[PDB]
Design a binder for this molecule. Structure first.
Ligand SMILES: Fc1ccccc1CNC1CCOCC1
Ligand SMILES: [Zn+2]
Length: 140
């Protein structure tokens, strides 16, 4: 689990979105595993605006933050998980590292701020849904 809190937006994995998220929907995209809902309180996070390929991510199933190198966001085949069938996921970055289903929502961060959240795992990789292209998260 986990979210990004930027402005009056809450960014969550689409598959973990609650009824309250869907009732306060701003934007969602199944292909990216993202959903954004509106918040009452302002959040603490800053979104990275950059093309970094190095950062640090939180792994709940290890209680640890790991430094990783990661691929640029691309359209990637993802094998079946407990929460999606085998399918193509867009705007996905991969790194070598540990990820289980419950790790989804952990933040990946670089020197510029939040890059994305954990969205995929298995076979010794961790996949992250990028948010750095969602420039509208920084306004309104
Ligand atoms: F790293 C740990 C070590 C022991 C217990 C718990 C943690 C994880 N701390 C969280 C805090 C909220 O943001 C994500 C990381
Ligand atoms: Zn960066």
């Amino acid at each position: 689990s986990g979210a990004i809190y930027v402005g009056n937006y809450r960014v969550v994995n689409r598959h973990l979105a609650t009824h309250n998220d869907w009732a306060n929907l701003v934007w969602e995209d199944s292909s990216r595993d993202l959903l954004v809902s509106s918040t009452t309180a302002q959040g603490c996070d800053t979104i990275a605006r950059c093309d970094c390929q190095t950062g640090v991510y939180y792994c709940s199933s290890r209680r640890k933050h790991y430094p990783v190198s990661f691929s640029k966001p691309s359209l990637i085949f993802v094998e079946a998980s407990e929460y999606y069938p085998a399918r193509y996921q867009s705007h996905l970055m991969l790194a070598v590292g540990h990820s289980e289903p419950g790790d989804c929502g952990g933040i990946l961060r670089c020197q510029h701020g939040v890059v994305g959240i954990v969205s995929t795992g298995g076979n010794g990789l961790v996949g992250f849904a990028d948010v750095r292209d969602l420039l509208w998260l920084d306004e309104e």
